[PDB]
Amino acid sequence: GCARWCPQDSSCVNATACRCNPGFSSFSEIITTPMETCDDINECATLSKVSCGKFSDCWNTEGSYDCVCSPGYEPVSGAKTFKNESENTCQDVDECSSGQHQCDSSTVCFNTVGSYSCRCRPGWKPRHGIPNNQKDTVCE
Ligand SMILES: C[As](C)(=O)[O-]
Ligand SMILES: [Ca+2]
Ligand SMILES: [Ca+2]
């Protein structure tokens, strides 16, 4: 059988009951009424569950979730999206060597984990207001 009144995001279990689809939850384990709702589980809140690993972030979605390397980090496996630690290959991006940085020609790019900084070349001095060791740094 298959109850046809099954609420959204749930699938029939028999002729008089339904079950929330994987990724959703309901108040009762078994839906026996069309008034019951199947709500999205936030996999990123349960701090209990394992992590995405280092340099990553958990992003919740309606019906699922995704792990992504944080800004300043990129996956060596080309896999922009992953599910667990084991799939984590987020390494830091070297904006200086990759020439992706945007330091004033008057400065020298210095790479850091997750970011990067522009420093004053020796014998040079920072312009006014703006300080050194920064992405907006400028020297004269
Ligand atoms: C993509 As949907 C509205 O079936 O959760
Ligand atoms: Ca979710
Ligand atoms: Ca970096």
Swiss-Prot record:
Expression is restricted to myeloid cells. Highest expression was found in peripheral blood leukocytes, followed by spleen and lymph nodes, with intermediate to low levels in thymus, bone marrow, fetal liver, placenta, and lung, and no expression in heart, brain, skeletal muscle, kidney, or pancreas. Expression is also detected in monocyte/macrophage and Jurkat cell lines but not in other cell lines tested. High expression in mast cells. It is found in: Cell membrane; Cell projection, Ruffle membrane. Disulfide bonds join 2-12, 6-18, 20-38, 44-58, 52-67, 69-90, 96-109, 103-118, 120-139. Autoproteolytically cleaved into 2 subunits, an extracellular alpha subunit and a seven-transmembrane beta subunit. Residues 1-39, 40-91, 92-140 form the EGF-like domain. Glycans are attached at residues 14, 84. It is linked to Vibratory urticaria: An autosomal dominant disorder characterized by localized hives and systemic manifestations in response to dermal vibration, with coincident degranulation of mast cells and increased histamine levels in serum. Forms a heterodimer, consisting of a large extracellular region non-covalently linked to a seven-transmembrane moiety. Interacts with chondroitin sulfate; the interaction with chondroitin sulfate is calcium-dependent. Interacts with CD55. Has no murine ortholog. Belongs to the G-protein coupled receptor 2 family. Adhesion G-protein coupled receptor (ADGR) subfamily. The GPS region of the GAIN-B domain is necessary, but not sufficient for receptor cleavage, which require the entire extracellular stalk. Binding to chondroitin sulfate is mediated by the fourth EGF domain. Cell surface receptor that binds to the chondroitin sulfate moiety of glycosaminoglycan chains and promotes cell attachment. Promotes granulocyte chemotaxis, degranulation and adhesion. In macrophages, promotes the release of inflammatory cytokines, including IL8 and TNF. Signals probably through G-proteins. Is a regulator of mast cell degranulation. This is Adhesion G protein-coupled receptor E2. It comes from Homo sapiens. The gene is ADGRE2. The chain holds residues 28 to 260 of 823 of the full protein.
